[PDB]
Amino acid sequence: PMEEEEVETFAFQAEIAQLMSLIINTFYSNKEIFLRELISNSSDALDKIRYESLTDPSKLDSGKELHINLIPNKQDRTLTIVDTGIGMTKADLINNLGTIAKSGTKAFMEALQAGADISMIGQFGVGFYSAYLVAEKVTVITKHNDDEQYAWESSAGGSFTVRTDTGEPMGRGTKVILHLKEDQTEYLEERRIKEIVKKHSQFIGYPITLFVEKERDKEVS
Numbered sequence: 001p002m003e004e005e006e007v008e009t010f011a012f013q014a015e016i017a018q019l020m021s022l023i024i025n026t027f028y029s030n031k032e033i034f035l036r037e038l039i040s041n042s043s044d045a046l047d048k049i050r051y052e053s054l055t056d057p058s059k060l061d062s063g064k065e066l067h068i069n070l071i072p073n074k075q076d077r078t079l080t081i082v083d084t085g086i087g088m089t090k091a092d093l094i095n096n097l098g099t100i101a102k103s104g105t106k107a108f109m110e111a112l113q114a115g116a117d118i119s120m121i122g123q124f125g126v127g128f129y130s131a132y133l134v135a136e137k138v139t140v141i142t143k144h145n146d147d148e149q150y151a152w153e154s155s156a157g158g159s160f161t162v163r164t165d166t167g168e169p170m171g172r173g174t175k176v177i178l179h180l181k182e183d184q185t186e187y188l189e190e191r192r193i194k195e196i197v198k199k200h201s202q203f204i205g206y207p208i209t210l211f212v213e214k215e216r217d218k219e220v221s
């Protein structure tokens with residue numbers, strides 16, 4: 001008791017659940033495209049707030065800088081992507097992250113079943129789920145103007161939660177935290193991240209900064 005937090009439990013829409021189970025339980029080569037999908041989503045969100053701001057500068061009250069940060073953390077085997085885009089409302093999380101059918105799900109599963117490369121995922125409108133190629137749990141923290149901050153979370157298994165987040169306030173935008181699987185820690189390495197960004201995500205119209213830890217003082221190693 002004491003403190004109270006709204007936390008809502010949802011089932012993924014049946015075909016989304018079937019897709020996630022394929023993604024997780026089937027071997028697929030060329031998983032590095034998960035990063036491309038995340039950066040694409042950030043870029044679209046950033047485009048949206050920039051566009052709205054042409055007409056209403058006040059929409060930038062919550063964060064004037066439009067950018068993306070990539071944060072690998074070897075301490076807890078996470079890779080976080082943060083952007084200062086338009087963010088999502090509660091309904092946007094619920095609609096976009098699982099509760100309803102997505103047009104391309106079935107066809108995408110049929111393509112995978114035929115041997116398509118996982119890279120096609122983005123075209124089918126289910127790109128977010130590529131996170132599950134590398135992560136056993138994904139947390140999405142989001143904040144849209146005129147709404148409160150929310151945190152979506154799922155370790156697959158057919159369920160996800162949406163909670164009102166009173167933690168680290170983001171101002172405005174989305175932060176995706178990938179808890180990487182043991183056989184996917186390569187994505188924590190600066191060398192690998194740089195390689196995949198150069199390969200798949202060139203000319204993103206916003207600065208991308210990689211946070212690195214290379215100067216830690218020995219006295220606090």
Ligand SMILES: CC(C)c1cc(C(=O)N2Cc3ccc(CN4CCN(C)CC4)cc3C2)c(O)cc1O
Pocket residue numbers: 037038039041042043044045046048083085086087088096128140142173174176
């Ligand atoms: C977790 C994924 C999905 C993700 C989302 C965002 C984010 O906050 N977004 C807000 C937003 C607004 C517009 C668009 C462009 N399209 C999307 C499809 N829609 C039906 C029409 C508008 C995209 C987004 C994504 C994010 O910043 C990063 C993420 O990884």
